[PDB]
């Protein structure tokens, strides 16, 4: 009578019809449920991602460590849903934001939408009620820890120091998710570990997708800087499979570099040759120096524009 795929099957079936599509799912599957998503800016992590990008209508949490290229990210996924004619927030607790550097990554910052909140609930309130207005592709709210309850901001006594900034930041992902969906508003958080950051208790379990960013390497040519590159770990992701990886390259005052991407893709999946020290595409002489490289992509825009068109085809 047991005939395990077939009974296994059904059993998946029933768990993603009683709990929605994604709560389960075989790692090496792969997936036509195509969705609808914001480009993250990266190509390697749009892949690692299995829809091309951040869901949309979907809670994202981007944690890391300060300099990790959080931000960036959050930047260039807005700049791309812009550009997509979308409407973008930025929900500031931080008073960090470079519009200048905005701008580079291609942000629409005169059309941007800011809000600087007085509290957490607030913070949260505010975009709860951007958010059921549907008039929103993207909200970004910078540290989920600068989400400091009212009663704490102001000078409240260490007795019934409730563990309320995961109590508040639960309560309003319970209610803001919900609408998200029906909005179609992706909500990226952005969590810096300095539960995670306390809020991110409630954030883990309401994520639809969740990004480890990390930075790991100086990207240095010669004897010099010129950029860090960076790891993201897509640890959780109801919507394809997770705990696909993705690096690139962020050099200094600019975003992530395409003609890295491109570099660095292009040689895994072959269609360039790396041979030791020094890189060649179609028999052509690419460079010494995966800068060398960089530059020569970033100078012949016609070559690269056929290997993000080739590489393009190969996966998606």
């Not at 570099?257 to 999946?269: A, Q």
């Not at 041979?275 to 002489?285: D, I, L, V």
């Amino acid at each position: 009578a047991p005939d395990r795929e077939k009974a296994l099957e059904l059993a998946m079936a029933q768990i993603d019809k009683n709990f929605g599509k994604g709560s389960v799912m075989r790692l090496g599957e792969e997936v036509r449920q195509p969705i609808s998503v914001i480009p993250t800016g990266s190509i390697s992590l749009d892949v690692a991602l299995g829809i091309g990008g951040l869901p949309r209508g979907r809670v994202i949490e981007i944690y890391g460590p300060e300099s990790s290229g959080k931000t960036t990210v959050a930047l260039h996924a807005v700049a791309n849903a812009q550009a997509a004619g979308g409407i973008a927030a930025f929900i500031d607790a931080e008073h960090a934001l470079d519009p200048e550097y905005a701008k580079k990554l291609g942000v629409d910052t005169d059309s941007l939408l800011v809000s600087q909140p007085d509290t957490g609930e607030q913070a949260l309130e505010i975009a709860d009620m951007l958010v059921r207005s549907g008039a929103l592709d993207i909200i970004v709210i910078d540290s989920v820890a600068a989400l400091v309850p009212r009663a704490e901001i102001e000078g409240e006594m260490g007795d019934s120091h409730v563990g309320l900034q995961a109590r508040l930041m639960s309560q309003a992902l319970r209610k803001m998710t919900g609408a998200l969906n029906n909005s179609g508003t992706t909500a990226i958080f952005i969590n810096e570990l300095r539960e995670t950051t306390t809020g991110g208790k409630a954030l883990k379990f309401y994520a639809s997708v969740r990004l480890d960013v990390r930075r790991i390497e100086t990207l240095k040519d010669g004897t010099d800087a010129v950029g860090n590159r960076t790891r993201v770990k897509v640890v959780k992701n109801k919507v394809s499979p997770p705990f696909k990886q993705a690096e690139f390259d962020i050099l200094y005052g600019q975003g992530i570099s395409r003609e890295g991407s491109l570099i660095d893709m292009g040689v895994e999946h072959g269609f360039i040759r790396k041979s030791g020290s020094w890189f060649t595409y179609e028999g052509e002489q690419l460079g010494q120096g995966k800068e060398n490289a960089r530059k020569f992509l970033l100078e012949n825009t016609d070559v690269a524009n056929e290997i993000e068109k080739k590489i393009k085809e190969k996966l998606g």
